[PDB]
Amino acid sequence: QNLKSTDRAVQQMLDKAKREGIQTVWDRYEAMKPQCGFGETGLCCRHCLQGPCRINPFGDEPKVGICGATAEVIVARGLDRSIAAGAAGHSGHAKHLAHTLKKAVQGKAASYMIKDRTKLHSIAKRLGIPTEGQKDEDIALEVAKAALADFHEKDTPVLWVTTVLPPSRVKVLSAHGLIPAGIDHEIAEIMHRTSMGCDADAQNLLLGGLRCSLADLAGCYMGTDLADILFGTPAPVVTESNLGVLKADAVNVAVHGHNPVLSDIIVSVSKEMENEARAAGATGINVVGICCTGNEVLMRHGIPACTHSVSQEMAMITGALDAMILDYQCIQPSVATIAECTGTTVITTMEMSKITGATHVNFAEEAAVENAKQILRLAIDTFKRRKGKPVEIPNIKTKVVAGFSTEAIINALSKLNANDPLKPLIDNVVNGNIRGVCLFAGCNNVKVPQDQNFTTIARKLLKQNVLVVATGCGAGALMRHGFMDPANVDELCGDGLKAVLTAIGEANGLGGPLPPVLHMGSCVDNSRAVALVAALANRLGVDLDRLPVVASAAEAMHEKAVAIGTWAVTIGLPTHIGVLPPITGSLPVTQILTSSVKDITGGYFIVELDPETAADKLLAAINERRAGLGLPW
């Protein structure tokens, strides 16, 4: 089972699923092998009904699609569509929050409000929205309107790109025509240009993809901005992670998906129904997190994270998961069938994301509190049904310090230098105590033993004094293996990094250091890392492609991860991906994405499936940036 997951709780539940005959994601993967080599390399096209077309990676015919589409075109078109689909997910999440904020301040949804007035005003300032002499509800209405306007063409480009990157970066991107005109506009243009008989030049196609990836970044940054206004900007918080945060004697309710518009309300409402649960025989309602919706409520409320990504079914296998509350994205639809065997009540809540066999609750912000109590009652009902059943909850959990929004990191740093808070970080980059910064992002992937790349790479970078930040299921992997527990700093961190985390932790009234890895939040909160890096760039007066900052989508899976990886490259970062994206069937495309793009944006992909090699390549990229700045390394 350690070939399937490096997480010991997951291994224990894999043994249980096996003896109970419950099929898992790993079983369905084994049943899918050998996978199709045309698809894996990108050399398959189904964009018209003359297809499917395939191209032999090597050998004889077929060498070209039926319409004349070359390997280069087919691979670039497929990649572009994955970027657009990712942009559609992150920006659909952000669009939903924009409508939620508008509803809140127009009086149409009392469960929602402006919780972070400071963030609201700073966003308005960044966008050029006048605040002086405005009431907060009118400022927020203007902010929501601007958010919705970035989805279509207008007299300005997408402001959630142009106002969040350094002007010098915006200038480089505009010179290449890469600034998106509108988020949904770019998504539609990708779908058009990649349809049959349209764009058929790999470089032209890929430039479109980079522009669409910046539409994805805009949606991520919008999502983070709006969720912080509505639900509060995260600050440092202490909690726990892994299956051992389930409790047999409580009603265990997982919030799973990406958009916390409802799961933030579920958190609040569950706290008040602690007595309706006590009357059903439970100690209380135990809300736990899965995937990014879990990250959102972990970052803001300290809700413990139960599990992530590829292992999400295992939470159910314990027998203790009374309800799983779903919004959208990264939910294995197998959960609706596994629930028949584990007793979990699986509940969908979003109109465009239903699963056959799952109960559906038509959530509306106008009715959020009522929907939440309806769902929590089903959970309580489900707890009642398992009175006297034995559960197998692995008694395995880690301590997690998290909540490191960019505002929180700057505040923590300000305790070492109140009026120039980035300077202590830059000072230690310069003197070598911090070699560089690496962002771990993305998903787990059944092809990679769960968490093996994240932890292998993180370990090598940390010993080399790299400051590691993480989001999404990269943060989930690292938290479940103890990388967010400050007690592990001595074991994990080089002496220079230890000294810096210790200095900052002690200065913030903490028993000791910051944790080994800084959890910056959900997948849309990759935007927070952009905020941090853009702020460092502006403090140093250089562009992002001169900073010793890298990114690693160490076990990527979702179209969203392809979009993120692509905008990481577009804003100027060396960007590792530890699973094969479907590009190797075209050497020209691969050479653009791993080399020539350097000359356009300064970033570039590092495709490397061996995690020790990937760490060495990420270190070399960091050290090359250091040398470009004239710094020792």
Encoding tokens for residue 296? Answer: 């959102």
Q: What distances in angstroms separate CA 19 from CA 8, 22, 24, 448, 500, one per listed residue?
A: 17, 8, 12, 23, 48
Q: Which is nearer to ligand FES, 70 or 131 (CB)?
A: 70
- Which positions from 53 through 82 interact with ligand FES, judged by CB under 6 A? 54
Beta bridge partner(s), residue 11: none
**If we measure between CA atoms, which residue out of 180, 166, 170, 163 comes closest to residue 127?**
163
Q: Which is nearer to ligand SF4, 403 or 582 (CB)?
A: 582
According to the binding rule CB under 6 A, does residue 383 interact with ligand FES?
Answer: no
* Residue 550, SS3 per DSSP: strand
Shortest separation between residue 112's beta carbon and ligand FES, angstroms:
43
Q: Which is nearer to ligand FES, 43 or 178 (CB)?
A: 43
- Amino acid identity, position 184: D
62 binds, options ligand FES, Fe ion, a second copy, none, Cβ within 5 to 8 A by partner type = a second copy
Encoding tokens for residue 554? Answer: 């160490």
According to the binding rule CB under 6 A, does residue 244 interact with ligand FES?
Answer: no
- Out of 16, 18, 29, 52, the only residue in the binding site for ligand FES (CB under 6 A) is 52
* Residue 489, SS3 per DSSP: helix
Burial 164-184 (b: 16+ CB within 10 A, else e): bbbeebbebbeeeebbbbbbb
Q: Which is nearer to a second copy, 26 or 112 (CB)?
A: 26
Q: Which is nearer to Fe ion, 473 or 551 (CB)?
A: 473
* Residue 509, SS3 per DSSP: coil
Shortest separation between residue 45's beta carbon and ligand SF4, angstroms:
3
Stretch that binds a second copy, among 347-355, 482-490, 498-506, 612-620 (CB under 8 A): 347-355
Shortest separation between residue 186's beta carbon and a second copy, angstroms:
9
Q: Which is nearer to ligand FES, 32 or 175 (CB)?
A: 32
Shortest separation between residue 335's beta carbon and a second copy, angstroms:
7
* Residue 306, SS3 per DSSP: strand
- Which positions from 462 through 521 interact with a second copy, judged by CB under 8 A? none
Q: Which is nearer to ligand FES, 49 or 279 (CB)?
A: 49
- Out of 22, 85, 94, 179, the only residue in the binding site for a second copy (CB under 8 A) is 85
Q: Is residue 45 a known part of a binding site?
A: yes
- Which positions from 6 through 45 interact with a second copy, judged by CB under 8 A? 25, 28-29, 31-32, 35-36, 38-40, 44
Q: Is residue 292 a known part of a binding site?
A: yes
Tell me, rounded to whole angstroms, the distance of Cα 580 from its chain centroid.
19
- How many residues in the shown chain lie near a second copy by CB under 8 A? 99
38 binds, options ligand SF4, Fe ion, ligand FES, none, Cβ within 5 to 8 A by partner type = ligand FES
Site string for a second copy, 581-600 (x = CB under 8 A): xx------------------
- Which positions from 166 through 225 interact with a second copy, judged by CB under 8 A? 177, 182-185, 187-202, 204, 208
- Which positions from 270 through 309 interact with a second copy, judged by CB under 8 A? none
According to the binding rule CB under 6 A, does residue 44 interact with ligand FES?
Answer: yes
Q: Is residue 558 a known part of a binding site?
A: no
Q: Which is nearer to ligand SF4, 71 or 94 (CB)?
A: 71
**Cis bond before residue 421 (omega within 30° of 0):** no
In angstroms, rounded to a whole number, what is the distance separating the alpha carbons of residues 498 and 465?
Answer: 8
Angle of helix 472-480 relative to helix 291-301, nearest 10 degrees, comes to 70
Which residues lie near ligand SF4 (CB under 6 A)? 45-48, 50-51, 53, 65-67, 69, 74, 196
According to the binding rule CB under 6 A, does residue 36 interact with ligand FES?
Answer: yes
Burial 480-506 (b: 16+ CB within 10 A, else e): bbbbbbbebbeebbbebbbbbbbbbbe
Q: Which is nearer to ligand SF4, 263 or 332 (CB)?
A: 332
What backbone phi and psi angles, to 5 degrees, belong to 484? -110, 15
Encoding tokens for residue 112? Answer: 């929602």
Per the document, the length of the chain is 633
Q: Which is nearer to ligand FES, 475 or 589 (CB)?
A: 589
In angstroms, rounded to a whole number, what is the distance separating the alpha carbons of residues 391 and 17?
Answer: 13
In angstroms, rounded to a whole number, what is the distance separating the alpha carbons of residues 538 and 534?
Answer: 6
According to the binding rule CB under 8 A, does residue 334 interact with a second copy?
Answer: yes
- How many residues in the shown chain lie near ligand FES by CB under 6 A? 7
Q: Is residue 341 a known part of a binding site?
A: no
44 binds, options ligand FES, ligand SF4, Fe ion, none, Cβ within 5 to 8 A by partner type = ligand FES
**If we measure between CA atoms, which residue out of 71, 7, 84, 9 comes closest to residue 42?**
71
Q: CB-based contacts of 595: which residues, under 8 Å, 6+ apart?
A: 604
380 contacts 280 by C-beta, under 8 angstroms: yes
Angle of helix 526-540 relative to helix 202-231, nearest 10 degrees, comes to 100
Q: Is residue 523 a known part of a binding site?
A: yes
39 binds, options ligand SF4, Fe ion, ligand FES, none, Cβ within 5 to 8 A by partner type = ligand FES
Task: Name the CA radius of gyration of the chain, rounded.
Answer: 24
Backbone φ/ψ region at 156: left (φ over 0), alpha (ψ -120 to 50), beta:
beta
Q: Which residues are annotated as a binding site for [4Fe-4S] cluster?
A: 36, 44-45, 48, 53, 67
Q: Which residues are annotated as a binding site?
A: 36, 44-45, 48, 53, 67, 258, 292, 330, 443, 473, 523
Q: Which residues are annotated as a binding site for [Ni-4Fe-5S] cluster?
A: 258, 292, 330, 443, 473, 523
